[PDB]
Amino acid sequence: AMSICPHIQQVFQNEKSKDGVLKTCNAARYILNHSVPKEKFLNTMKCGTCHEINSGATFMCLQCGFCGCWNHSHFLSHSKQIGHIFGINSNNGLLFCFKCEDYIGNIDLINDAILAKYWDDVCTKTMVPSMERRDGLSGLINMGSTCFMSSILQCLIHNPYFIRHSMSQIHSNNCKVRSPDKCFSCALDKIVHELYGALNTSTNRQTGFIYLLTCAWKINQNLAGYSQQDAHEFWQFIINQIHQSYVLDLPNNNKQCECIVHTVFEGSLESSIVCPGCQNNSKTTIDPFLDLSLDIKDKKKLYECLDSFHKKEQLKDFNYHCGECNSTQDAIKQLGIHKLPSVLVLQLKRFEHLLNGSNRKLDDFIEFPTYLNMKNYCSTKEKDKENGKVPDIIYELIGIVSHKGTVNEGHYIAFCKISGGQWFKFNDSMVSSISQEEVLKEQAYLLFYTIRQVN
Amino acid sequence: TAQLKSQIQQYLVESGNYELISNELKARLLQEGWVDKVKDLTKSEMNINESTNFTQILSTVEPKALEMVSDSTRETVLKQIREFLEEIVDT
Amino acid sequence: EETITIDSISNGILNNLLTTLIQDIVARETTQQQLLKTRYPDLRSYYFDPNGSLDINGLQKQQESSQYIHCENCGRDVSANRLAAHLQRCLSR
Amino acid sequence: MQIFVKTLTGKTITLEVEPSDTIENVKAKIQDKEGIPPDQQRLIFAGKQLEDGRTLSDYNIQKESTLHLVLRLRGG
Amino acid sequence: DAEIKGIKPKVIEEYSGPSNDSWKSLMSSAKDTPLQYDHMNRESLKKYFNPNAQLIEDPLDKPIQYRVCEKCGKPLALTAIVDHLE
Ligand SMILES: [Zn+2]
Ligand SMILES: [Zn+2]
Ligand SMILES: [Zn+2]
Ligand SMILES: [Zn+2]
Ligand SMILES: [Zn+2]
Ligand SMILES: [Zn+2]
Ligand SMILES: [Zn+2]
Ligand SMILES: [Zn+2]
Numbered sequence: 001a002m003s004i005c006p007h008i009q010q011v012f013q014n015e016k017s018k019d020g021v022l023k024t025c026n027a028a029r030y031i032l033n034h035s036v037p038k039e040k041f042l043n044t045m046k047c048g049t050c051h052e053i054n055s056g057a058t059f060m061c062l063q064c065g066f067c068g069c070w071n072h073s074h075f076l077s078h079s080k081q082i083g084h085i086f087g088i089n090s091n092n093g094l095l096f097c098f099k100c101e102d103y104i105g106n107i108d109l110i111n112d113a114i115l116a117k118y119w120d121d122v123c124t125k126t127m128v129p130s131m132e133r134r135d136g137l138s139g140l141i142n143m144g145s146t147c148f149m150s151s152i153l154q155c156l157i158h159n160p161y162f163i164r165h166s167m168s169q170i171h172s173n174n175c176k177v178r179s180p181d182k183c184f185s186c187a188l189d190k191i192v193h194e195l196y197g198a199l200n201t202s203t204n205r206q207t208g209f210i211y212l213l214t215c216a217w218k219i220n221q222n223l224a225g226y227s228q229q230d231a232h233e234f235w236q237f238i239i240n241q242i243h244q245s246y247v248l249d250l251p252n253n254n255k256q257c258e259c260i261v262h263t264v265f266e267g268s269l270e271s272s273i274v275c276p277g278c279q280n281n282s283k284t285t286i287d288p289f290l291d292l293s294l295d296i297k298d299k300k301k302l303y304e305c306l307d308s309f310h311k312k313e314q315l316k317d318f319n320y321h322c323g324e325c326n327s328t329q330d331a332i333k334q335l336g337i338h339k340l341p342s343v344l345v346l347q348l349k350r351f352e353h354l355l356n357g358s359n360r361k362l363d364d365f366i367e368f369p370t371y372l373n374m375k376n377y378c379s380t381k382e383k384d385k386e387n388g389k390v391p392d393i394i395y396e397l398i399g400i401v402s403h404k405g406t407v408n409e410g411h412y413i414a415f416c417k418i419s420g421g422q423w424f425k426f427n428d429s430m431v432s433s434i435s436q437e438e439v440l441k442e443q444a445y446l447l448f449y450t451i452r453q454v455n
Numbered sequence: 456t457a458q459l460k461s462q463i464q465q466y467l468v469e470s471g472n473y474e475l476i477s478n479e480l481k482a483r484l485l486q487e488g489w490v491d492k493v494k495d496l497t498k499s500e501m502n503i504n505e506s507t508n509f510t511q512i513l514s515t516v517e518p519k520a521l522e523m524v525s526d527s528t529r530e531t532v533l534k535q536i537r538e539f540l541e542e543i544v545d546t
Numbered sequence: 547e548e549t550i551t552i553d554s555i556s557n558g559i560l561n562n563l564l565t566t567l568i569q570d571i572v573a574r575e576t577t578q579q580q581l582l583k584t585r586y587p588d589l590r591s592y593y594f595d596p597n598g599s600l601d602i603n604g605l606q607k608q609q610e611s612s613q614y615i616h617c618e619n620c621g622r623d624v625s626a627n628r629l630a631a632h633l634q635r636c637l638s639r
Numbered sequence: 640m641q642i643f644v645k646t647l648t649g650k651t652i653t654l655e656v657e658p659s660d661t662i663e664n665v666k667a668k669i670q671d672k673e674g675i676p677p678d679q680q681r682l683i684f685a686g687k688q689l690e691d692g693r694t695l696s697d698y699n700i701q702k703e704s705t706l707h708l709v710l711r712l713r714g715g
Numbered sequence: 716d717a718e719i720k721g722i723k724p725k726v727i728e729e730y731s732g733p734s735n736d737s738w739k740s741l742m743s744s745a746k747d748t749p750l751q752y753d754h755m756n757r758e759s760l761k762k763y764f765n766p767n768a769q770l771i772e773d774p775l776d777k778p779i780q781y782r783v784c785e786k787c788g789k790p791l792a793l794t795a796i797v798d799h800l801e
Contacts (some may be wrong), residue, residue: 051461105577106584126782144630145715160774184772225630290686452774
């Protein structure tokens with residue numbers, strides 16, 4: 001029967017004391033989110049007693065300006081000596097009670113303290129997530145050949161950027177069509193409603209998916225679920241539909257699109273054309289991308305496939321005249337990344353074309369990492385004490401789509417990672433727990449990576 | 456005196472090098488899977504001890520998490536700290 | 547009065563960085579679990595099957611083609627595994 | 640103008656095209672070089688598959704842009 | 716490996732008991748400072764990412780934060796609850 005800190009409960013029996021606490025919590029957290037790194041170190045991570053930086057957690061006092069460390073028990077002494085039992089951890093904004101010797105993590109008002117002014121209304125209008133729906137885990141039944149659709153939809157539904165978009169009511173608020181049987185984004189929001197909440201009021205939780213199938217049939221019957229199709233083609237199809245619904249909902253020389261697709265998934269390639277003699281130049285072309293398609297033959301690791309993507313090539317069928325040496329040359333071409341996306345989507349080219357006009361699937365295992373560093377693929381280097389260096393730019397793997405079968409027939413499954421590190425396998429109606437060690441052995445076709453650390 | 460440690464740390468922060476060290480350490484530990492191992496270790500200790508009390512859970516997690524740091528990460532990061540230290544101390 | 551060296555001070559800097567990070571990670575874990583346990587007194591883990599057969603509720607794959615869907619467009623019950631085929635013949639006109 | 644196609648192996652080839660050339664025409668040129676029929680080709684630029692009946696200019700494909708060629712992996 | 720004696724005088728020249736400072740001294744600057752991330756460096760984001768990029772730091776740190784509407788059952792981001800109508 002989990003308890004609550006009685007020391008903060010006592011304080012909260014007085015309304016102005018409660019408001020004072022929340023106001024200070026909001027201020028400390030605001031400071032932590034709006035302070036440059038050196039300032040944050042020097043003014044929130046410096047112990048007032050020993051003056052060390054990062055002597056374990058540093059706590060910002062709730063009642064005064066003092067900061068105190070954990071490792072040398074220096075906040076603990078401030079609490080005993082001044083009687084201030086509450087401090088905020090400057091790494092995470094969490095509130096510690098030094099009497100309980102525990103954080104206060106289970107008071108909803110404190111956790112969502114930015115809404116303190118409206119809390120009464122928040123509780124009357126809303127409830128916490130139901131246990132069974134909290135992670136949005138639910139299967140999408142096979143409605144014919146719908147694995148290429150459902151595998152993609154599970155990756156969308158477990159994508160934190162799409163999640164946040166849908167739950168923030170951005171589409172709902174501005175949609176000019178408002179029918180889930182016509183509007184793809186409405187159908188998607190309905191799926192999110194069904195999986196995380198409850199539609200008013202066994203085949204369970206398929207309503208949104210059926211709407212989606214209905215939208216798809218009207219726009220492109222080949223991709224609507226009757227026949228076997230390519231998950232990558234369906235992925236590109238759905239993100240284009242989200243973009244198209246944004247443009248429709250606009251009330252109105254502005255080149256970058258501001259929709260959820262184009263602010264999440266879009267990066268740019270830099271393609272350079274360089275003289276093999278002068279090696280100086282170059283004629284650079286910038287091409288947008290929403291994903292990268294990688295070759296895999298004769299390779300065993302994802303980094304090898306990215307290395308191949310980024311490798312210089314000498315072109316033999318390109319007409320090229322160098323201006324620095326004034327002569328015809330076979331130009332050197334290279335692709336690198338000009339701009340990275342928040343979510344990087346990778347397609348492994350698991351197919352080859354044979355001389356008899358048939359195609360064949362490439363089933364070879366390609367090792368892919370839990371965290372992907374893209375620094376070696378970025379075209380432009382920063383200064384470093386000589387050519388320069390790109391800093392670590394690390395993504396977290398959150399989704400995989402795999403195919404079992406041959407080029408013309410098979411089955412798709414999705415694997416998604418949620419908070420805490422648990423992976424789930426989405427095989428049409430069946431949602432199951434799977435270990436990371438086993439997920440990492442899958443034959444990956446599509447990989448979804450979210451930005452995690454940028455140095 | 457022990458003002459030295461705090462002094463040295465202040466210089467590291469003002470110089471920009473504390474950030475480089477802190478950021479590179481975090482990146483290394485993240486990529487080698489240590490961050491997630493420590494989360495798993497923490498969940499396990501909470502289950503074994505039937506407790507979410509931070510002080511008691513930390514007492515078992517922290518020592519172990521420190522041992523879990525790869526030799527590679529420890530010596531690479533130490534090497535980097537020592538280079539930045541050899542910049543601004545006389546020995 | 548123990549001797550201070552680049553090696554010793556460096557070890558102390560690394561220890562400061564590592565214990566802070568550990569403490570951050572642990573605080574995030576314990577607060578989250580405290581919330582989940584308070585929020586959901588009867589909280590149960592998602593089922594894990596070493597055999598790879600049972601879902602997160604400990605259930606087997608339901609028998610399709612045993613399930614049906616009521617088509618909102620025409621009012622007929624349709625076998626769930628044939629809904630896409632049905633919609634091709636039902637949504638047109 | 641010249642544009643590029645990064646083929647199935649990753650080898651890049653060059654096409655001579657007009658901004659007004661249709662996707663069908665482009666796929667025919669790729670077939671001449673790579674031997675893949677047009678109905679088997681998926682040509683990707685800027686996150687979209689290029690559709691028959693449209694032109695290169697419809698997709699803002701310019702001089703020295705690179706198109707990405709893939710096939711289809713069907714599943715149910 | 717050898718014994719340290721002091722801190723170089725030139726470092727002190729331009730760098731350098733209970734403290735008197737206050738964490739609340741940061742509010743003035745913080746009010747004027749754009750949103751910062753702990754481990755997504757601002758200058759590197761300008762160089763390597765789009766200027767309009769959406770960014771969620773550590774998106775899997777904790778489970779999805781939301782509440783459910785009592786009237787219609789919609790899952791709502793905490794920043795969307797006040798304005799939400801039927
Ligand atoms: Zn307490
Ligand atoms: Zn201290
Ligand atoms: Zn105090
Ligand atoms: Zn809509
Ligand atoms: Zn867009
Ligand atoms: Zn030349
Ligand atoms: Zn019907
Ligand atoms: Zn509502």
